[PDB]
CSV table of N, CA, C and O and ligand atoms in Angstrom, one decimal:
chain,number,residue,atom,x,y,z
T,264,UNK,N,-35.5,-33.0,-98.9
T,264,UNK,CA,-34.5,-32.6,-100.7
T,264,UNK,C,-34.8,-31.1,-100.6
T,264,UNK,O,-33.4,-31.0,-101.3
T,265,UNK,N,-35.7,-30.8,-100.7
T,265,UNK,CA,-35.8,-29.6,-100.9
T,265,UNK,C,-34.7,-28.5,-100.2
T,265,UNK,O,-33.7,-27.7,-100.5
T,266,UNK,N,-34.9,-28.5,-98.8
T,266,UNK,CA,-34.2,-27.8,-97.7
T,266,UNK,C,-32.5,-28.4,-98.0
T,266,UNK,O,-32.0,-27.4,-98.1
T,267,UNK,N,-32.1,-29.3,-98.2
T,267,UNK,CA,-30.9,-29.8,-98.3
T,267,UNK,C,-30.3,-29.0,-99.7
T,267,UNK,O,-29.2,-28.8,-99.7
T,268,UNK,N,-31.1,-29.3,-100.5
T,268,UNK,CA,-30.6,-28.7,-102.2
T,268,UNK,C,-30.4,-27.2,-101.8
T,268,UNK,O,-29.5,-26.6,-102.5
T,269,UNK,N,-31.4,-26.2,-101.1
T,269,UNK,CA,-31.0,-24.8,-100.6
T,269,UNK,C,-29.7,-24.6,-100.4
T,269,UNK,O,-29.4,-23.8,-100.3
T,270,UNK,N,-29.9,-25.5,-99.2
T,270,UNK,CA,-28.7,-25.0,-98.1
T,270,UNK,C,-27.4,-25.6,-98.9
T,270,UNK,O,-26.7,-24.8,-99.0
T,271,UNK,N,-27.4,-26.3,-99.5
T,271,UNK,CA,-26.1,-26.8,-100.7
T,271,UNK,C,-26.0,-25.5,-101.4
T,271,UNK,O,-24.8,-25.2,-101.8
T,272,UNK,N,-26.7,-25.0,-102.1
T,272,UNK,CA,-26.7,-24.0,-103.2
T,272,UNK,C,-26.1,-22.7,-102.4
T,272,UNK,O,-25.3,-22.4,-103.0
T,273,UNK,N,-26.8,-22.6,-101.3
T,273,UNK,CA,-26.6,-20.9,-100.7
T,273,UNK,C,-24.8,-21.3,-100.3
T,273,UNK,O,-24.0,-20.7,-100.3
T,274,UNK,N,-24.7,-22.8,-99.6
T,274,UNK,CA,-22.9,-22.5,-99.1
T,274,UNK,C,-21.9,-22.2,-100.6
T,274,UNK,O,-21.5,-21.6,-100.5
T,275,UNK,N,-22.5,-22.8,-101.2
T,275,UNK,CA,-21.6,-22.9,-102.7
T,275,UNK,C,-21.7,-21.3,-103.5
T,275,UNK,O,-20.7,-21.4,-104.0
T,276,UNK,N,-22.8,-20.7,-103.4
T,276,UNK,CA,-22.4,-19.4,-103.8
T,276,UNK,C,-21.9,-18.4,-102.6
T,276,UNK,O,-21.2,-17.3,-103.2
T,277,UNK,N,-21.9,-19.1,-101.4
T,277,UNK,CA,-20.7,-18.3,-100.3
T,277,UNK,C,-19.6,-18.4,-99.9
T,277,UNK,O,-18.8,-17.6,-100.1
T,278,UNK,N,-18.8,-19.3,-101.1
T,278,UNK,CA,-17.6,-19.8,-100.6
T,278,UNK,C,-16.9,-18.8,-101.3
T,278,UNK,O,-15.8,-18.8,-101.4
T,279,UNK,N,-17.5,-18.6,-102.8
T,279,UNK,CA,-16.9,-17.2,-103.6
T,279,UNK,C,-16.5,-16.4,-103.1
T,279,UNK,O,-15.5,-15.7,-103.3
T,280,UNK,N,-17.6,-15.9,-102.3
T,280,UNK,CA,-17.5,-14.4,-101.7
T,280,UNK,C,-16.6,-14.9,-100.5
T,280,UNK,O,-15.6,-13.7,-100.2
T,281,UNK,N,-16.7,-15.8,-100.1
T,281,UNK,CA,-15.5,-15.9,-99.1
T,281,UNK,C,-14.2,-16.0,-99.7
T,281,UNK,O,-13.1,-15.6,-98.9
T,282,UNK,N,-14.0,-16.7,-100.8
T,282,UNK,CA,-12.7,-16.8,-101.1
T,282,UNK,C,-12.1,-15.6,-101.6
T,282,UNK,O,-11.1,-14.9,-101.3
T,283,UNK,N,-13.1,-14.3,-102.0
T,283,UNK,CA,-12.5,-13.2,-102.9
T,283,UNK,C,-12.0,-12.5,-101.5
T,283,UNK,O,-11.5,-11.5,-102.2
T,284,UNK,N,-13.3,-12.1,-100.6
T,284,UNK,CA,-13.1,-10.6,-99.8
T,284,UNK,C,-11.4,-11.1,-98.5
T,284,UNK,O,-11.1,-10.2,-98.9
T,285,UNK,N,-11.8,-12.4,-98.6
T,285,UNK,CA,-10.4,-12.9,-97.5
T,285,UNK,C,-9.2,-12.4,-98.7
T,285,UNK,O,-9.0,-13.3,-99.5
T,286,UNK,N,-8.0,-11.6,-98.4
T,286,UNK,CA,-6.9,-11.6,-99.5
T,286,UNK,C,-5.5,-12.4,-99.1
T,286,UNK,O,-4.9,-12.3,-99.7
T,287,UNK,N,-5.9,-13.4,-97.9
T,287,UNK,CA,-5.0,-14.2,-97.2
T,287,UNK,C,-5.5,-15.5,-97.3
T,287,UNK,O,-4.7,-16.5,-96.2
T,288,UNK,N,-6.5,-15.8,-97.8
T,288,UNK,CA,-6.9,-17.3,-98.4
T,288,UNK,C,-5.9,-18.1,-98.6
T,288,UNK,O,-5.8,-19.5,-98.5
T,289,UNK,N,-4.9,-17.7,-99.7
T,289,UNK,CA,-4.0,-18.7,-100.8
T,289,UNK,C,-2.8,-18.3,-100.5
T,289,UNK,O,-2.2,-18.0,-101.2
T,290,UNK,N,-2.5,-18.2,-99.0
T,290,UNK,CA,-1.4,-17.7,-98.6
T,290,UNK,C,-0.2,-18.8,-98.8
T,290,UNK,O,1.2,-18.5,-99.2
T,291,UNK,N,-0.3,-20.1,-99.2
T,291,UNK,CA,0.4,-21.0,-99.1
T,291,UNK,C,0.7,-21.1,-100.3
T,291,UNK,O,2.5,-21.0,-100.8
T,292,UNK,N,0.2,-20.6,-101.5
T,292,UNK,CA,0.8,-20.8,-102.7
T,292,UNK,C,1.5,-19.8,-103.0
T,292,UNK,O,2.5,-19.7,-103.7
T,293,UNK,N,1.3,-18.4,-102.6
T,293,UNK,CA,2.1,-17.1,-102.8
T,293,UNK,C,3.5,-17.2,-101.9
T,293,UNK,O,4.3,-16.9,-102.3
T,294,UNK,N,3.2,-18.2,-100.8
T,294,UNK,CA,4.4,-18.2,-99.8
T,294,UNK,C,5.4,-18.9,-101.0
T,294,UNK,O,6.6,-18.5,-100.9
T,295,UNK,N,5.0,-20.1,-101.4
T,295,UNK,CA,6.1,-21.1,-102.5
T,295,UNK,C,6.4,-20.2,-103.6
T,295,UNK,O,7.7,-20.1,-103.7
T,296,UNK,N,5.3,-19.3,-104.0
T,296,UNK,CA,6.2,-18.2,-105.5
T,296,UNK,C,7.4,-17.3,-104.7
T,296,UNK,O,8.1,-17.0,-105.2
T,297,UNK,N,6.7,-16.5,-103.5
T,297,UNK,CA,7.8,-15.7,-102.5
T,297,UNK,C,8.9,-16.5,-102.5
T,297,UNK,O,10.1,-15.7,-102.9
T,298,UNK,N,9.0,-17.9,-102.3
T,298,UNK,CA,10.7,-18.2,-101.5
T,298,UNK,C,11.5,-18.2,-103.1
T,298,UNK,O,12.4,-18.1,-102.9
T,299,UNK,N,10.6,-18.8,-103.9
T,299,UNK,CA,11.4,-19.2,-104.8
T,299,UNK,C,12.3,-17.8,-105.8
T,299,UNK,O,13.1,-17.5,-106.1
T,300,UNK,N,11.3,-16.8,-105.7
T,300,UNK,CA,11.4,-15.6,-106.2
T,300,UNK,C,12.7,-14.8,-105.6
T,300,UNK,O,14.0,-14.4,-105.8
T,301,UNK,N,12.5,-14.9,-104.2
T,301,UNK,CA,13.8,-14.7,-103.1
T,301,UNK,C,14.6,-14.9,-103.2
T,301,UNK,O,16.1,-14.5,-103.5
T,302,UNK,N,14.9,-16.6,-103.7
T,302,UNK,CA,16.2,-17.6,-103.2
T,302,UNK,C,16.9,-17.0,-104.8
T,302,UNK,O,18.0,-16.6,-104.8
T,303,UNK,N,16.2,-16.8,-106.1
T,303,UNK,CA,16.6,-16.4,-107.0
T,303,UNK,C,17.3,-15.0,-107.2
T,303,UNK,O,18.4,-14.9,-107.4
T,304,UNK,N,16.4,-14.3,-106.4
T,304,UNK,CA,17.1,-12.9,-106.6
T,304,UNK,C,18.2,-12.9,-105.6
T,304,UNK,O,19.2,-12.1,-106.0
T,305,UNK,N,18.1,-13.6,-104.3
T,305,UNK,CA,19.4,-13.2,-103.7
T,305,UNK,C,20.5,-13.9,-104.6
T,305,UNK,O,22.1,-13.4,-104.2
T,306,UNK,N,20.6,-15.2,-105.4
T,306,UNK,CA,21.6,-15.7,-105.6
T,306,UNK,C,22.1,-14.6,-107.0
T,306,UNK,O,23.9,-14.7,-106.7
T,307,UNK,N,21.3,-13.7,-107.2
T,307,UNK,CA,21.7,-12.7,-108.7
T,307,UNK,C,22.5,-11.3,-107.6
T,307,UNK,O,23.6,-11.5,-108.1
T,308,UNK,N,22.2,-11.1,-106.5
T,308,UNK,CA,22.7,-10.0,-106.0
T,308,UNK,C,23.6,-10.4,-105.2
T,308,UNK,O,25.1,-9.9,-104.8
T,309,UNK,N,24.2,-11.8,-104.8
T,309,UNK,CA,25.5,-12.4,-104.4
T,309,UNK,C,26.6,-11.8,-105.5
T,309,UNK,O,27.6,-11.9,-105.1
T,310,UNK,N,26.1,-12.0,-106.9
T,310,UNK,CA,27.6,-11.3,-107.4
T,310,UNK,C,28.0,-10.3,-107.6
T,310,UNK,O,28.8,-9.9,-108.3
T,311,UNK,N,27.7,-9.4,-106.8
T,311,UNK,CA,28.3,-8.1,-106.2
T,311,UNK,C,28.9,-8.0,-105.4
T,311,UNK,O,29.4,-7.0,-104.6
V,32,UNK,N,26.0,-2.4,-134.8
V,32,UNK,CA,24.4,-2.1,-133.9
V,32,UNK,C,24.4,-3.7,-134.6
V,32,UNK,O,24.2,-4.4,-135.7
V,33,UNK,N,23.4,-4.3,-133.6
V,33,UNK,CA,22.2,-5.3,-133.8
V,33,UNK,C,22.9,-6.6,-134.0
V,33,UNK,O,22.3,-7.9,-134.1
V,34,UNK,N,24.6,-6.5,-133.9
V,34,UNK,CA,24.8,-7.9,-133.9
V,34,UNK,C,26.1,-8.2,-132.7
V,34,UNK,O,26.7,-7.4,-132.5
V,35,UNK,N,25.9,-9.3,-131.7
V,35,UNK,CA,26.5,-9.0,-131.0
V,35,UNK,C,28.3,-9.2,-131.1
V,35,UNK,O,28.5,-10.3,-131.7
V,36,UNK,N,29.1,-8.6,-130.5
V,36,UNK,CA,30.5,-7.9,-131.1
V,36,UNK,C,30.9,-8.2,-129.6
V,36,UNK,O,30.4,-7.7,-128.5
V,37,UNK,N,32.3,-7.6,-130.0
V,37,UNK,CA,33.1,-7.3,-128.8
V,37,UNK,C,33.6,-5.9,-128.6
V,37,UNK,O,33.8,-5.6,-129.9
V,38,UNK,N,33.3,-5.8,-127.4
V,38,UNK,CA,33.1,-4.1,-127.7
V,38,UNK,C,34.1,-3.5,-126.0
V,38,UNK,O,34.4,-3.8,-125.5
V,39,UNK,N,34.9,-2.5,-126.1
V,39,UNK,CA,35.9,-1.7,-125.2
V,39,UNK,C,35.7,-0.3,-125.6
V,39,UNK,O,36.2,0.4,-126.1
V,40,UNK,N,35.0,0.2,-124.6
V,40,UNK,CA,34.4,1.4,-124.1
V,40,UNK,C,35.4,1.7,-123.2
V,40,UNK,O,35.2,1.6,-121.9
V,41,UNK,N,36.3,2.7,-123.5
V,41,UNK,CA,37.2,3.6,-122.4
V,41,UNK,C,37.7,3.0,-121.1
V,41,UNK,O,37.5,3.0,-120.4
V,42,UNK,N,38.0,1.5,-121.9
V,42,UNK,CA,38.7,0.4,-120.7
V,42,UNK,C,37.8,-0.4,-120.5
V,42,UNK,O,38.3,-1.6,-120.1
V,43,UNK,N,36.5,-0.4,-120.8
V,43,UNK,CA,35.5,-1.3,-120.3
V,43,UNK,C,35.5,-2.1,-121.3
V,43,UNK,O,34.8,-1.9,-122.1
V,44,UNK,N,35.9,-3.5,-121.0
V,44,UNK,CA,35.6,-4.7,-122.0
V,44,UNK,C,34.7,-5.5,-121.7
V,44,UNK,O,34.6,-6.1,-120.6
V,45,UNK,N,33.7,-5.8,-122.6
V,45,UNK,CA,32.7,-7.0,-122.4
V,45,UNK,C,32.6,-7.7,-124.0
V,45,UNK,O,32.8,-7.2,-124.8
V,46,UNK,N,31.5,-8.0,-123.9
V,46,UNK,CA,31.0,-9.1,-125.3
V,46,UNK,C,29.3,-8.4,-125.1
V,46,UNK,O,28.5,-8.9,-124.2
V,47,UNK,N,28.9,-8.6,-125.8
V,47,UNK,CA,27.4,-8.4,-126.5
V,47,UNK,C,26.7,-7.7,-127.4
V,47,UNK,O,28.1,-7.1,-128.3
V,48,UNK,N,25.7,-7.4,-127.6
V,48,UNK,CA,25.1,-6.8,-128.5
V,48,UNK,C,24.5,-5.9,-128.2
V,48,UNK,O,24.3,-5.4,-127.1
V,49,UNK,N,24.8,-4.5,-129.0
V,49,UNK,CA,24.3,-2.8,-128.4
V,49,UNK,C,23.1,-2.5,-129.2
V,49,UNK,O,23.0,-3.0,-130.8
V,50,UNK,N,22.6,-2.2,-128.8
V,50,UNK,CA,21.4,-1.6,-129.6
V,50,UNK,C,21.1,-0.2,-128.9
V,50,UNK,O,21.4,0.5,-127.7
V,51,UNK,N,20.2,1.0,-130.0
V,51,UNK,CA,19.6,1.9,-129.5
V,51,UNK,C,18.9,2.3,-128.5
V,51,UNK,O,17.7,1.9,-128.4
V,52,UNK,N,19.3,2.7,-127.3
V,52,UNK,CA,18.7,2.8,-125.9
V,52,UNK,C,17.8,3.8,-125.8
V,52,UNK,O,18.0,4.9,-126.3
V,53,UNK,N,16.8,3.5,-124.7
V,53,UNK,CA,15.6,4.5,-124.6
V,53,UNK,C,15.8,5.0,-123.3
V,53,UNK,O,14.8,5.9,-123.0
V,54,UNK,N,16.8,4.7,-122.7
V,54,UNK,CA,17.1,4.9,-121.6
V,54,UNK,C,17.3,7.1,-121.5
V,54,UNK,O,17.9,7.2,-122.1
V,55,UNK,N,16.7,7.5,-120.4
V,55,UNK,CA,16.3,8.6,-120.2
V,55,UNK,C,18.0,9.3,-119.2
V,55,UNK,O,17.5,9.9,-118.4
V,56,UNK,N,19.1,8.9,-119.7
V,56,UNK,CA,20.2,9.7,-118.9
V,56,UNK,C,20.2,10.9,-118.4
V,56,UNK,O,20.5,11.5,-119.9
V,57,UNK,N,20.3,11.3,-117.7
V,57,UNK,CA,20.6,12.8,-117.6
V,57,UNK,C,22.1,13.4,-117.4
V,57,UNK,O,22.8,12.3,-117.2
V,58,UNK,N,21.9,14.4,-117.6
V,58,UNK,CA,23.1,15.0,-118.7
V,58,UNK,C,24.6,14.7,-117.6
V,58,UNK,O,25.3,14.9,-118.4
V,59,UNK,N,24.3,14.7,-115.9
V,59,UNK,CA,25.6,14.5,-115.3
V,59,UNK,C,25.9,12.7,-115.2
V,59,UNK,O,26.5,12.4,-114.8
V,60,UNK,N,25.3,11.6,-115.9
V,60,UNK,CA,25.3,10.4,-116.0
V,60,UNK,C,25.8,9.8,-116.8
V,60,UNK,O,25.5,10.4,-118.3
V,61,UNK,N,26.5,9.0,-117.0
V,61,UNK,CA,27.8,8.2,-117.7
V,61,UNK,C,27.5,7.1,-118.3
V,61,UNK,O,27.2,6.9,-119.4
V,62,UNK,N,27.4,6.3,-117.4
V,62,UNK,CA,26.9,4.7,-117.7
V,62,UNK,C,25.8,4.0,-116.6
V,62,UNK,O,26.0,4.7,-115.6
V,63,UNK,N,24.8,3.4,-117.0
V,63,UNK,CA,23.9,2.8,-116.3
V,63,UNK,C,24.1,1.2,-115.3
V,63,UNK,O,25.1,0.4,-116.3
V,64,UNK,N,23.7,1.0,-114.8
V,64,UNK,CA,23.7,-0.6,-113.8
V,64,UNK,C,22.6,-1.1,-113.8
V,64,UNK,O,21.2,-0.9,-114.0
V,65,UNK,N,22.4,-2.3,-113.5
V,65,UNK,CA,21.2,-3.2,-113.2
V,65,UNK,C,21.4,-3.4,-111.7
V,65,UNK,O,22.2,-3.3,-110.6
V,66,UNK,N,20.5,-4.6,-111.1
V,66,UNK,CA,20.0,-5.0,-109.8
V,66,UNK,C,21.2,-5.9,-109.5
V,66,UNK,O,21.4,-5.9,-107.9
V,67,UNK,N,22.2,-6.4,-110.5
V,67,UNK,CA,23.3,-7.5,-110.1
V,67,UNK,C,24.8,-6.4,-110.1
V,67,UNK,O,25.4,-7.2,-110.2
V,68,UNK,N,24.4,-5.3,-110.2
V,68,UNK,CA,25.9,-4.4,-110.3
V,68,UNK,C,26.4,-4.5,-111.7
V,68,UNK,O,27.7,-5.2,-111.6
V,69,UNK,N,26.2,-4.7,-112.7
V,69,UNK,CA,26.5,-5.0,-113.9
V,69,UNK,C,26.1,-3.9,-114.9
V,69,UNK,O,25.4,-3.6,-114.7
V,70,UNK,N,27.3,-3.2,-115.9
V,70,UNK,CA,27.0,-2.4,-117.0
V,70,UNK,C,25.5,-2.5,-117.6
V,70,UNK,O,25.9,-4.1,-118.4
V,71,UNK,N,24.7,-2.1,-118.1
V,71,UNK,CA,23.6,-2.3,-119.0
V,71,UNK,C,23.3,-1.5,-119.8
V,71,UNK,O,23.5,-1.9,-121.1
V,72,UNK,N,23.9,-0.1,-119.7
V,72,UNK,CA,24.0,0.7,-120.9
V,72,UNK,C,25.2,1.3,-120.5
V,72,UNK,O,25.6,2.0,-119.7
V,73,UNK,N,25.9,2.3,-121.7
V,73,UNK,CA,27.1,3.0,-121.9
V,73,UNK,C,26.5,4.1,-122.6
V,73,UNK,O,26.3,4.2,-123.5
V,74,UNK,N,27.3,5.1,-122.4
V,74,UNK,CA,27.5,6.3,-123.6
V,74,UNK,C,28.9,6.4,-124.3
V,74,UNK,O,29.9,6.4,-123.7
V,75,UNK,N,28.6,6.5,-125.4
V,75,UNK,CA,29.8,6.8,-126.5
V,75,UNK,C,30.2,7.7,-126.5
V,75,UNK,O,30.0,8.5,-125.9
V,76,UNK,N,32.0,7.3,-126.8
V,76,UNK,CA,32.7,8.5,-127.0
V,76,UNK,C,32.7,9.0,-128.3
V,76,UNK,O,31.8,8.9,-128.8
V,77,UNK,N,33.6,10.3,-128.5
V,77,UNK,CA,33.6,11.0,-129.8
V,77,UNK,C,32.0,11.6,-129.8
V,77,UNK,O,31.7,12.7,-129.3
V,78,UNK,N,31.2,10.7,-130.6
V,78,UNK,CA,30.1,11.4,-130.9
V,78,UNK,C,29.1,10.6,-129.4
V,78,UNK,O,29.6,9.7,-129.0
V,79,UNK,N,27.9,11.3,-129.1
V,79,UNK,CA,27.4,11.4,-127.6
V,79,UNK,C,26.0,10.5,-128.0
V,79,UNK,O,25.1,11.2,-128.1
R,625,NAG,C1,35.8,13.9,-131.7
R,625,NAG,O1,35.2,14.0,-129.9
R,625,NAG,C2,34.7,15.0,-129.6
R,625,NAG,C3,33.9,15.1,-128.4
R,625,NAG,O2,35.0,15.1,-127.2
R,625,NAG,C4,33.0,15.1,-130.6
R,625,NAG,O3,32.4,16.5,-130.1
R,625,NAG,C5,33.7,15.7,-131.9
R,625,NAG,O4,32.4,15.6,-132.9
R,625,NAG,C6,34.7,14.3,-132.5
R,625,NAG,N1,34.8,14.5,-133.6
R,625,NAG,C7,34.6,13.9,-135.1
R,625,NAG,C8,34.8,14.1,-136.0
R,625,NAG,O5,33.5,12.9,-134.5
């Protein structure tokens, strides 16, 4: 029990650093936001 | 000012509210534009 608990705690501790260090782990949601922004900006620019 | 009316400045006709702008129009600049090629700020005739 103790070894399993320690392993789980270590993994949960490392997961935050893994998310924070890499700046491309959340690329899907950012891609969604960027796609919406690009579509709207293009529609605005077509007025010229 | 501060109430949206029809404006006609030197043949440029439009509608909207006019406010004292904080833009730093350089001395060779007459009117400003935004990302969609529309007039955003304008310089007055008579008094500048
Ligand atoms: C008339 O317009 C000129 C700018 O061309 C301006 O210098 C002058 O003050 C105006 N006259 C009055 C009475 O505001």
